[PDB]
Structures are given as structure tokens and as C-alpha cells.
Amino acid sequence: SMSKVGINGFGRIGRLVLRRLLEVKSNIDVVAINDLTSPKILAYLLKHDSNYGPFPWSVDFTEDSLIVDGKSIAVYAEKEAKNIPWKAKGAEIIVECTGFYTSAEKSQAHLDAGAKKVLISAPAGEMKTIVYNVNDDTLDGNDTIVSVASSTTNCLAPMAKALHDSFGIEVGTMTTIHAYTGTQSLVDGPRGKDLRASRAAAENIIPHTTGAAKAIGLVIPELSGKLKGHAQRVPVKTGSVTELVSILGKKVTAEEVNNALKQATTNNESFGYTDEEIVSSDIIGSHFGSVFDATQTEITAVGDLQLVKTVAWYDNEYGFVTQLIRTLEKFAKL
Amino acid sequence: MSKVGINGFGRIGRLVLRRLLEVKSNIDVVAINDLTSPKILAYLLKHDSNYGPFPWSVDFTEDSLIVDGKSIAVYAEKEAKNIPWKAKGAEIIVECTGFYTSAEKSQAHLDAGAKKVLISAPAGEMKTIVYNVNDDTLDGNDTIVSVASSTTNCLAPMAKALHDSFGIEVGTMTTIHAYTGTQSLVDGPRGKDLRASRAAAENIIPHTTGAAKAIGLVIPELSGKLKGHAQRVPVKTGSVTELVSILGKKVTAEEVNNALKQATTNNESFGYTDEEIVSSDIIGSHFGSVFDATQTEITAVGDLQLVKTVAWYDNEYGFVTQLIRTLEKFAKL
Amino acid sequence: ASMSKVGINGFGRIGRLVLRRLLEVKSNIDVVAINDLTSPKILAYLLKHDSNYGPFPWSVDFTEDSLIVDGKSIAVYAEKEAKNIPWKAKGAEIIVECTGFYTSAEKSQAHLDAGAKKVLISAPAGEMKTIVYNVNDDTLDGNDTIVSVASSTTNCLAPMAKALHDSFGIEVGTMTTIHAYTGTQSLVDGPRGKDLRASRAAAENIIPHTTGAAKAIGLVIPELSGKLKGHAQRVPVKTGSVTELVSILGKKVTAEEVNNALKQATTNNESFGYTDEEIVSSDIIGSHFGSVFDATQTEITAVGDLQLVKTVAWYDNEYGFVTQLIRTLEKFAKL
Amino acid sequence: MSKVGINGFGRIGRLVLRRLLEVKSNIDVVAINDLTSPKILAYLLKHDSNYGPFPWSVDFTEDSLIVDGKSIAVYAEKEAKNIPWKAKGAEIIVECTGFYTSAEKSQAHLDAGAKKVLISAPAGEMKTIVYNVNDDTLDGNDTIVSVASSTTNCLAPMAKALHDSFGIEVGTMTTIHAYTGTQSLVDGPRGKDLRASRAAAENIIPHTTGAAKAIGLVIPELSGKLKGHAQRVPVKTGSVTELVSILGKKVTAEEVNNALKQATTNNESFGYTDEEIVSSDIIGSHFGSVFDATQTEITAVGDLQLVKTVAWYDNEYGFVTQLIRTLEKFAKL
Numbered sequence A: 001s002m003s004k005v006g007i008n009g010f011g012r013i014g015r016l017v018l019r020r021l022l023e024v025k026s027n028i029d030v031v032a033i034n035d036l037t038s039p040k041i042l043a044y045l046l047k048h049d050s051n052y053g054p055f056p057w058s059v060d061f062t063e064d065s066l067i068v069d070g071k072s073i074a075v076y077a078e079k080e081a082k083n084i085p086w087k088a089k090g091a092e093i094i095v096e097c098t099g100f101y102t103s104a105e106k107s108q109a110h111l112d113a114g115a116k117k118v119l120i121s122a123p124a125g126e127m128k129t130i131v132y133n134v135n136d137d138t139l140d141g142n143d144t145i146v147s148v149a150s151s152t153t154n155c156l157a158p159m160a161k162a163l164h165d166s167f168g169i170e171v172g173t174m175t176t177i178h179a180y181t182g183t184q185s186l187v188d189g190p191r192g193k194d195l196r197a198s199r200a201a202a203e204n205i206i207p208h209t210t211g212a213a214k215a216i217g218l219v220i221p222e223l224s225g226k227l228k229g230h231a232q233r234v235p236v237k238t239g240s241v242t243e244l245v246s247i248l249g250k251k252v253t254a255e256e257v258n259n260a261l262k263q264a265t266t267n268n269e270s271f272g273y274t275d276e277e278i279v280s281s282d283i284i285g286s287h288f289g290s291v292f293d294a295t296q297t298e299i300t301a302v303g304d305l306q307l308v309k310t311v312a313w314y315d316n317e318y319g320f321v322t323q324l325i326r327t328l329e330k331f332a333k334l
Numbered sequence B, D: 001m002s003k004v005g006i007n008g009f010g011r012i013g014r015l016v017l018r019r020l021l022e023v024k025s026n027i028d029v030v031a032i033n034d035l036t037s038p039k040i041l042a043y044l045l046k047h048d049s050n051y052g053p054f055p056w057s058v059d060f061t062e063d064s065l066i067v068d069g070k071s072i073a074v075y076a077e078k079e080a081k082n083i084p085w086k087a088k089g090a091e092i093i094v095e096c097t098g099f100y101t102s103a104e105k106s107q108a109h110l111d112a113g114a115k116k117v118l119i120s121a122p123a124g125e126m127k128t129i130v131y132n133v134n135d136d137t138l139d140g141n142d143t144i145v146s147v148a149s150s151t152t153n154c155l156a157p158m159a160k161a162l163h164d165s166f167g168i169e170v171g172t173m174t175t176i177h178a179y180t181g182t183q184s185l186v187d188g189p190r191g192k193d194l195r196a197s198r199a200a201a202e203n204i205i206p207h208t209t210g211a212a213k214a215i216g217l218v219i220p221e222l223s224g225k226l227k228g229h230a231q232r233v234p235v236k237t238g239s240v241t242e243l244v245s246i247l248g249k250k251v252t253a254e255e256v257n258n259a260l261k262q263a264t265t266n267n268e269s270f271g272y273t274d275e276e277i278v279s280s281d282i283i284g285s286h287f288g289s290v291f292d293a294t295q296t297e298i299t300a301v302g303d304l305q306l307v308k309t310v311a312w313y314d315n316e317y318g319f320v321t322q323l324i325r326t327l328e329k330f331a332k333l
Numbered sequence C: 001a002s003m004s005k006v007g008i009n010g011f012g013r014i015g016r017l018v019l020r021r022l023l024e025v026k027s028n029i030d031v032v033a034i035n036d037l038t039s040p041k042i043l044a045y046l047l048k049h050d051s052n053y054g055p056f057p058w059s060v061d062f063t064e065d066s067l068i069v070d071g072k073s074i075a076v077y078a079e080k081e082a083k084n085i086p087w088k089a090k091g092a093e094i095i096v097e098c099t100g101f102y103t104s105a106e107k108s109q110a111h112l113d114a115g116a117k118k119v120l121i122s123a124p125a126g127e128m129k130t131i132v133y134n135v136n137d138d139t140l141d142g143n144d145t146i147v148s149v150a151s152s153t154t155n156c157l158a159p160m161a162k163a164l165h166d167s168f169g170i171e172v173g174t175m176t177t178i179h180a181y182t183g184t185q186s187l188v189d190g191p192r193g194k195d196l197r198a199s200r201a202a203a204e205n206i207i208p209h210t211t212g213a214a215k216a217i218g219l220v221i222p223e224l225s226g227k228l229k230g231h232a233q234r235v236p237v238k239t240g241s242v243t244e245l246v247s248i249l250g251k252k253v254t255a256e257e258v259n260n261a262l263k264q265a266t267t268n269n270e271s272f273g274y275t276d277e278e279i280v281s282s283d284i285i286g287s288h289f290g291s292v293f294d295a296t297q298t299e300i301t302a303v304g305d306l307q308l309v310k311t312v313a314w315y316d317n318e319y320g321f322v323t324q325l326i327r328t329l330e331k332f333a334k335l
């Protein structure tokens, strides 16, 4: 049905979309890219990656294009999605990764410029928001603009889904200890209105708001309004970890929690398990959206009260991208 | 006032001297034991990667440091029973090596001639003090005492206020904690803790801590009610403790915050902030703990409520100010 | 009856420390206005809390259009074009231009159009009068209206080069500065104008970086004009940097003889310090010198008559440089 | 000789095995000596903070690792003379501890039953090989040999190329070098190197290296003609070496670049780039050195000329590829 993709925002996520497509020998082809710079610079960045090393395929450029593994890809530099000649090269599905079109409204522009669907790499208000292998069954043939939420949502949802199915989550709160991202600052200085995002990212633990828990309802309707949470951004370049403290509907042991999660992760391409004593750098390059860590499970019980802490690692860049692509391969065949 | 000897002139031990001089303490530090030469200890005291130049002059001789013109004997005895504490009359040993964290181990300082030992770490079931939480339990018969971990000193005042105002039924803690000398610079063996083998400045590293588990030593009413752990991360000092609690009363954020504010009023140990601070803003703190009203979160569904409360701490200097407050009291008893 | 009222344009790393240092030295200069691109609330937050130097040592509060610092009111404007900044409202006479966007006489004379009398630019700014304090500040006079203090790297390099050239002659030389990362770099890998290297994650890489410190040294030491080149390697430290110079000197030397010459050049010299301690970059953070010559790193490599001389100086590229900018400013205001 | 033992299963020792498996060497690693348990060595081999997951299966028993299905004996003898190398017939020891960097010290492996030792570091006046610079000097009667430092492996190919084309009359080197396990995580004693005592991820740290001073072992004509030092900085691996030379001939940058381009043609050890790379781009390199044409700088005044040339190196994996090339050759003489 659909096999031709445009990327808007050839950034950390945008470039990795291309990387992953090619790694899996997908039959979707990226045919156009829009950003704000030259093909020379986009090529430079695609070839040389500080988190994942040299691109595995040949890369070259001309004044209006990239050439990747011998195939040509048009490069545009339109600040406004309207102006992208998606039509020209035949781009059916826009992977929207700029951070500036996070609305059904705004991503409309891509359809105006002639693409048939848009997948947004971020939370985008009230729309179909898919975590692959949690709720991608809610996607139908009539969907045109869908969100794959945040990396944190891809981490939290599968862990929350398994606990809720096995035990029931009554209420919970999350904290993600999260790699710093391009929304933060290199040195202390203004970064819009958010005071904390103004601070040097590689030199600080920085509290930071996230909607992963607040909006979990879109992905797991039964948990709607039952979770809150935030982040602490810390000085690692990628690789993050989400802790969820829940009140569950049954009394449990750690062994029981971990066996329920082991079952949910078995033959599960999206959601991995470990009982090894890994650290964040071990998750870099993960092909899961989320890796449940059984070594960090903790049950605090005082009589009838019980707090359950469960922890899952995630490569907020590559890991999340593997989910984005799963959802895209599916969305393209409807 | 009392003469002190410091065993282990490391991150903590050096900052103990710094803080004593800074507050113009009546304690005199007369001796230091470590594993190295006066020249290396002089170099490390003068030049600090986290706190900058030492604020006083530092020199060394073959067997001493000269700090602000005052002589401090230097010994290099790896067994504490061999340290000649009597030679300069060191009465109270500030035990900062990590290698004597029990009554039975620190007894070796009493054997070597000291009267009392204050241990800069958890040390099993001994009197364990967080200043301005339970320092009123000290008395003139105590000879070996612990000030627990920096995390305990962060946790305890926040837990005490919550418990006193609302009751804590159960809770769990995670501290996002600066890396420390127990970890590894490059991936390599670090005893039996597998995760401690990993490169500390390049990883988020889960790490076990007893701060919550043994909180009953400091706040007896909370024995068995808390658990927790740490995530060690690449900042050089400056840490933050989150506690998620079920309290005995339904609350709003403002109510929690006001109660904490009252607990920090005229409290030289426990500060308050409603500013959007980050960990480097806690470096050099003179509190053991600073509650952060900006991160308070109430998650409520029917009659169920989870309360998240967060406090910052400088696990080096901030904790040290607590250690020093405890030392000054312990010395006058 | 000297100029005493300052405006700061660009209340950034450098601009905020300009205020800090002025208060710290109890300058008779008052900062009466700040221009940047944001709210007083944000500026007050950034001034109070600093990731590199810790809590501001004086009280900080703000209103809808001002900061109140140590009880003194300072106007805040948000004009992206310098020509629009209302410097006359509080009588700002000298502008300390710290934005990075007005690094030429042609650009910075906008402040004059906007009612200021003089401008001191916290950066190289082409071929205008350029001062490294205690190297060539004697060249400033009453007719100088727009002046540059060059880069932190020039303030590190110049006093060392000057001492060497005066004592032995420098016939030719090349510099490399191992330099803390700065806000011209990138947090994550992504476009950063046209410099490909500046696009790379600054806290995760050693990044070669072009600098004019050596190339334009003739503005400060005219006898070395065109005799030096160099570059930077940007590395993951937040502040604190070090400059190595490899020279061919006009004389055969020993390390001790170079060290002693430098030691004499640093005696009673508030701008240029000396060390023979085994210091590392965090020990220079908050330095009150523009440059600290490190005798422990001096190296003479000689084969017959061919001799190469390596000299190394530390610098706190933020605060240490700022101390130099402030010395130059105090003198500028009294000419 | 196809059976090898590894003394010191650290950053270099583990990558030695990783690379041997990666190139499908016929070398058989039969034994490893270190200071710890198989469990711990297994965890370290499996999880690498710089290079990611080990590409082969790893298990262990109480006295062995099993790597890609093959058993490797693990010993824990802190003195090399006691390591039982004859048990599994380890003939060539790859000496990677840092504790045996001299003929006299590494002799202990031979007293312990091995036939040859290749030392992963400089080791005084003994045969010292940078592959594809002077590996032809390896001789069938050599039994103790060095591959010098990573810095040497970076410097030597560049210096050889320049010397062969233009003559190097005198030169000085500075390497901007990733931090290593000889440094400290937090400020604390580290033998007698004061600079080594400082927190490695939080400082620029000047550091002594023999790479230039001992270059005469590799390129005898350059003996005594180079000096240099390092600045250790906060990157986990990946380094850069700058050489400032007076050459024998007047040159342009294009001419230097062209000559270096030629030395790197069909040279598996010495690579070339004219892309604007940064240090993380060298991580995982299969070269000992990658000359970077983009940083070549000629400074000329009248008749005088200074030539600055620069090459990148993965001080871990890149150097290891050189160690393996040398090992393969050494095994067959």
C-alpha cells in the first residue's frame, strides 16, 4: 500500500529513523528530508554520530540531495511544512520529528503539501498515540495523523500494561532518570520560559516535567488519570531509566512481579527483560522500546499497604526509534 | 576544647578540617592518619576539584601539615590500633576511612588511646545521629557514634516532618546521587558490587543504600516503614532524594509545603527552597538537607494518595556540616 | 569626574560575571542597565544561580522591568537591535558589549547611536584598538570610543608571548589551547551554522576549533604581527582552559631561564600569575588573573642549533578573563 | 605458537580477546590471570561502557570463563612468577597489567613457563614495535617485546611519514588524551603522581608520557629529536596527537597532506581523513592512527617554518588492533 517516506526534522530522531529503516532492510524508502540547513551539514551529521558511531552505509551529497547507500533523497530547507514539495519525490508518509508541529492541526500542513499520512515522534495532544505492542491494534485504515508519544511513554506503557493486566494499578507515580536532550542548554542561559531548562545539562541533575504519566490514558485507557510523574535529566548522552511506584490491586512478591513481567516480555519485540546488573550505557543501541529490570524490583509492605517499585531501562534515542519504525511499518500497510 | 584526630583524610576527612576552620571551631585538630605522605595530603588539601583553593595556608614537613600556621601530626598506619593518638592527645577520632564502620572495628581507636569515635558513615546498630532530628539522644556515656550517610541526613529531616505533621504509613525512596570514590573511573573490578565496577562518569548506575532501611536508628517510629535505593549519576557532588509515601492524612501540595517550611524555620540543618534550583546550586550548602517545594506532587485516586517529596543535598560539604554540628555537641558531653 | 555608569548588553556567561566582579571589587562603576532578550525574572534566576561559580553573593530580586541587586535597581531592556536600546534613560555611558553579535566597530557604534558614549567589546572585533590589560593598555587614550579586549585565549597568550618576546625574541610560533566548552558549541549533535565541528556534542568530544588569538596577536603585540598561528581543542570541562605555545626563540635557552624570565614578568602583576604547583584546570576556576604561567610544563627540545620552546599558561576563560575586562573597563572609564 | 594467556583482563586485556574473536584469529586464548573472580570478569567482558555488548556468548564457572563456547582458565595470582601458565600451555603472554613493564619484570612469565611476552605498554630499552612502522625488526629469537603506548602508535606512523618525506630535525608533541584507569575518579592519593590524584572526568590534567622521548626505539633516526606530553581530558576514549616539527624541507600544507595520504594508502594500521571529525568518531577505529589533513598548519616567517600535524587514535580499540597485528606476527616467528 505505502512505501515512500518523508522526514521532517533530520535531528537525533530523524537521522536515526533513516538508520533503523535501513538496518532492518525495510521496504519503506526515505525519499525526501526537510530541515533547516545544507545537504553538506546533514550529510556530515548522518555520517558522524556521537552516540552510535559511523553510519553503516555510504553517504554523499549534492547541492539538493543526499545519496545514501547509493540512493538519492531530496533535501529541502523549508521552515514551514506547507512549502515542502512532498509531492515531487512522492512521499506518502511524513515522520514528523521537528518538535514544532505537535498538533493534528499543525501536521495538517503535511497533507496540504500532499502527503497522505503523518506520524509525529512526540506527544501531540488528544490523538491516536501508539506504543507499539501496547495499543497499535487501535490503528485503522482511516487514520491519517498519529503520535508515538515520548521515549518515556514507550518505556512506561509496556511496564504499566503488564502490571495493570496481572495485578491492577490503582494509583502510581513515576520518575525517569533521563539522558539530557536538545531541549536543554549547554551553558546556563535563557531557554524560553522554563527556568530549569536554562541550566547547563551536562553539569547538573535537572528536574523536568514530562507528560508520560499524565497522558498515559491515551495509550492505556484504564489508567487514565491514575498516574503522575516527572524526570531528572542527568549528564549521560543517551540511555535512560524509568521508575514507577504503584499501589497495586493485589498483594505481591518481587518474584511474582518479575515472573509476570518475564511473561509479558517473552517473544515481545518491543519490550525486553533483564536480570543482569546493567547500567545505562548497556541500553545504548537497544532494539526495544523498554527493558524491564528485575534486579530493581522492590516491594515495601506495612500490613495491608504495599508500594511496588518497578524499573525499566530505555534508549530514549535508538530504542524509542525502533518503536517508531514498528508503528510506521504498520501504519504504511493500512 | 577537645582535641581531634581524623582517620582517613579523604573527600570527607579534608572537608571536616575545612568546615572546622570555616566555623572557627574551638576543636583543635591535632592529628590525621591516612596512607600517604604529608606532601600528598598537603597537595590534596590545598587543591580541591569540587570546592576550589583551600581558604588557609597549607604546608607540610616530613611528619606534619602546617595549616594556617598550626601544626597537625600526620601518621600512615593502615591499622587503627597502631595510630599513636596519645602522642598529641587526640581525644575524639573522626573516623572517615570507610574501614571501621562498626563498634567492634572502631574500638581500635579507643584501644589506641582515644576517648570517643564519630564515624562518618552507617555503622550498624549503634547510636546514629542526624543533627536536628535526634541529636538529643546523645549523652555523656556515648563513646562510639555514627552520623549515618549523606542520604540519611537528607532523608531523615524530610521524613521526620512528614511523620510529625501527617504520619507516614509506608514509603520508598530513590536518591539520584553524585558519584563517589566507592565507584570506578573505568570499567573494572570493584569488590563484589558488579554495578560499582562500571565507569561512574559515563553511566546511570543503580546502587544499594541503607538510608531508608535503617532509618529507624534515627526515627524509631519509622522502623521497617521505608525502603529505597540510589541511582548514581555523572555529577561530581550534589544529590537529590525523592520519597514516595502514603501518609496518615489526606493532604494538598500546599499543605505539605507549609508543614515543611515550618520544620525548616530556624533550622540550621534543614533548609527550604521554592526556587527552581538544580544540583550544582546545592554545592557548598551549609544544610544537611534542603526541601524543594517545587517538586512536591500529590497523586490521588479515590481514597488512595501517593505523596512525593524531594530534597537536595550536597553529599560532601552539606553532610559534613551535619557531621561537624554532631561533633561539636559530642565533644562537649 | 570620570564615567561611572555602565550598561551591559548580553547578560550571559560573560555579562553576568561582569556584574559579579564589579560588585566583588567594590568598583565605583555602577551598572545601571542591562539589555538582553528575556524577562527580568529569567535574568534574576540566572544571576542568582550559577552552575560554575555557585550562588550570587548579593541579594537578587526583580520587577517587571528591572533587577534589584544588593538593594540597587538596574533597568532591564529586551531590544534585539542595539540601536533601539534606551541607554539614555538611566544614563548608561559605557556599554560592555557581551552578546557576540556586535563584534566590529561598524556594529558596535549602534550603542553610540542609542545614546552611550563608549563601548567595550568582550571579544575580538576586527582591527580596532584591542587591549590585553598589563600588556598594552598604555595604548588606550581619551579618543578611543570603541575598544575590544580580544578573547580569553588572547588574554592568556599575550602576557606569555610578551614576556618571551621581551626576554628572548619570538621568531615564529604556534599555539594550541585546550579550551573549556562554550555556548557557541552544541549540546547534542545538530546544525550550528556553517562550522561542521561546532555541530557536535560539546560535553562528549574533543573538538578542533578555529581561534584568531594567535593570528591577530599583532593588535596587542605589534612586533609579533603575523608571526603566530594556532587553534583550539574544545573539551568537556565547564570552564578553565590552558594555552600551549611552541616557539622558535631568538636565543638558546634553558627551562629554568624561561621560567625565571616569566616569574619576573609576573611579579607585582595583577593580570598575570605564576605557578610551580601541579595544578589542574579546576584549580584555575575563579582565578583573578587573565593568565597563570605554569613553570612545571615548560619544555625545551633542542637538536644542535634547532630549538623549540613550549610554554604553557592556564586561564579561567570565564572569570579570569572577566577580571581583565574589568581592569580595562576601569581604566577606559577614567581617560 | 598459537596458545596465548592474558595477564590483566582490564580495558586492554578484554579488548585483546574481543579483537582476536572479531578477526577470527587462529590464536587460541587458553588462560587469563587477574585479581578477581570469573563471575566478575564475565560481567565485565559482557558489558562494555565504551564498546557495548560483547558480540559472543559469555558464561563462567568457579575457575573459568566460557566464551563463544570455549573454556578459558582464570587464575588470580598477583605475582606473575606464580601464574600456572603451563597448565593449559599458554606460550605467549599478553602482559596488560601495567605491573611488569620491563624485561626484568616480565621475565617472571618465562620463569612461570611461558615462551614469549608481548607487553601492552612501554617497557624500557627492549624491542618495541609499532606495526607497519618497524614490525620487520621483530626477530625469531625475541622473547620479550613491547608495543609501546597508544600514543606511540599514533605518533610513530605520522612521524615516520614526515621524516621519510621531509626530514624531521626537531619536534614536540602534545596529545589531548582520554582519561584512563591510571587516574582517579575523585581527588585522592594515587602513588606519587600528584596530577594523577585529581578527578579525571572533571579536569584538564597535564600528564607525562614517553611517547616522543622513547621514539628512537621505533624510528632510530628520530632518537633524542622529539619531546612531548599529554593533557588528559574528560572523554572516555578517543584521543588526538599534535606534532609541531621543524622539517628538513620547506613545505605547503597540500604537500604534507599528499605525502601522508601516500603513507596511508593500503596501510591497515594508518588511516587518513579529510573530514571534520571529532573524538567520538574515532571510537572503534581499526587503525592505530588516523592522520587528519584538516588540522595541518604551516607557520612561516622568512626562512623559518613550523609544521603542525595531527592524528586521531582510539587509545583503547585502535591501539588494540595494533597489539593484535603485532601478536599475530610474533606468534609465528
Ligand SMILES: NC(=O)c1ccc[n+]([C@@H]2O[C@H](COP(=O)([O-])OP(=O)(O)OC[C@H]3O[C@@H](n4cnc5c(N)ncnc54)[C@H](O)[C@@H]3O)[C@@H](O)[C@H]2O)c1
Residues within 6 Å of the ligand: A008, A009, A010, A011, A012, A013, A014, A034, A035, A036, A037, A078, A079, A080, A097, A098, A099, A100, A121, A122, A149, A150, A151, A181, A182, A183, A316, A317, A320, C188, C189, C190, C191
Ligand atoms: N531525543 C530524545 O530523546 C527524544 C525521544 C523521543 C521523542 N523525541 C521528540 O522527537 C522530536 C525531535 O527531537 P530530537 O531530539 O531529534 O530534536 P533535535 O533538536 O535533535 O532535532 C530537531 C531537528 O529539527 C530541525 N528543525 C527545527 N525546526 C524545524 C523546522 N521548522 N523545519 C524543519 N526542521 C526543523 C533542526 O534543524 C533539527 O535538525 C521532538 O519532538 C522530541 O520531543 C525526542
Ligand SMILES: NC(=O)c1ccc[n+]([C@@H]2O[C@H](COP(=O)([O-])OP(=O)(O)OC[C@H]3O[C@@H](n4cnc5c(N)ncnc54)[C@H](O)[C@@H]3O)[C@@H](O)[C@H]2O)c1
Residues within 6 Å of the ligand: B007, B008, B009, B010, B011, B012, B013, B033, B034, B035, B077, B078, B079, B096, B097, B098, B099, B120, B121, B148, B149, B150, B180, B181, B182, B315, B316, B319, D186, D187, D188, D189
Ligand atoms: N559523598 C561522600 O563522599 C560521602 C558522604 C557521606 C559519608 N561518606 C563516608 O565517609 C567515608 C569516607 O568517604 P570519602 O568519600 O571521604 O572516601 P575517600 O575515599 O575520598 O577517603 C578515604 C580516605 O581514607 C584513606 N584510607 C583508606 N583506608 C585507610 C586505613 N586503613 N587507614 C587510614 N586511612 C585510610 C584513603 O587513603 C582516603 O584518603 C566512607 O565511610 C563514606 O561512606 C562519604
Ligand SMILES: NC(=O)c1ccc[n+]([C@@H]2O[C@H](COP(=O)([O-])OP(=O)(O)OC[C@H]3O[C@@H](n4cnc5c(N)ncnc54)[C@H](O)[C@@H]3O)[C@@H](O)[C@H]2O)c1
Residues within 6 Å of the ligand: A187, A188, A189, A190, C009, C010, C011, C012, C013, C014, C015, C035, C036, C037, C079, C080, C081, C097, C098, C099, C100, C101, C122, C123, C150, C151, C152, C182, C183, C184, C317, C318, C321
Ligand atoms: N565564554 C567564554 O569563555 C568567553 C570568554 C571571552 C569572551 N567571550 C565572548 O563574550 C561574548 C559573550 O560570550 P558568552 O559566553 O557570555 O555567551 P552567552 O551566549 O552565554 O551570552 C550571550 C548573551 O547575550 C544575549 N543576546 C544574544 N543576542 C542578543 C542581542 N541581539 N541583544 C541582546 N542580547 C542578546 C543572550 O540572550 C545571552 O544572555 C561573546 O562575544 C564571546 O565570544 C566568551
Ligand SMILES: NC(=O)c1ccc[n+]([C@@H]2O[C@H](COP(=O)([O-])OP(=O)(O)OC[C@H]3O[C@@H](n4cnc5c(N)ncnc54)[C@H](O)[C@@H]3O)[C@@H](O)[C@H]2O)c1
Residues within 6 Å of the ligand: B186, B187, B188, B189, D007, D008, D009, D010, D011, D012, D013, D033, D034, D035, D077, D078, D079, D095, D096, D097, D098, D099, D120, D121, D148, D149, D150, D151, D180, D181, D182, D315, D316, D319
Ligand atoms: N587505556 C589505554 O588507553 C591504554 C592504551 C595503551 C596501553 N595501555 C597500557 O596497557 C596496560 C593496561 O591498561 P588498562 O587501561 O587495561 O588498565 P586497567 O586498569 O583497565 O586494567 C588492568 C587489569 O590488570 C589487573 N591487575 C592489576 N594488577 C594485577 C596483577 N598484579 N596481576 C594480575 N592482574 C592485575 C586489574 O584487575 C585489571 O583488570 C597498562 O600498561 C597501560 O599503560 C593502556
Ligand SMILES: [Cl-]
Residues within 6 Å of the ligand: A152, A176, A178, A208, A209, A210, A231
Ligand atoms: Cl523527560
Ligand SMILES: [Cl-]
Residues within 6 Å of the ligand: B151, B175, B177, B207, B208, B209, B230
Ligand atoms: Cl548512594
Ligand SMILES: [Cl-]
Residues within 6 Å of the ligand: C081, C082, C083, C084, C110
Ligand atoms: Cl543595531
Ligand SMILES: [Cl-]
Residues within 6 Å of the ligand: C153, C177, C179, C209, C210, C211, C232
Ligand atoms: Cl577557542
Ligand SMILES: [Cl-]
Residues within 6 Å of the ligand: D151, D175, D177, D207, D208, D209, D230
Ligand atoms: Cl598519556
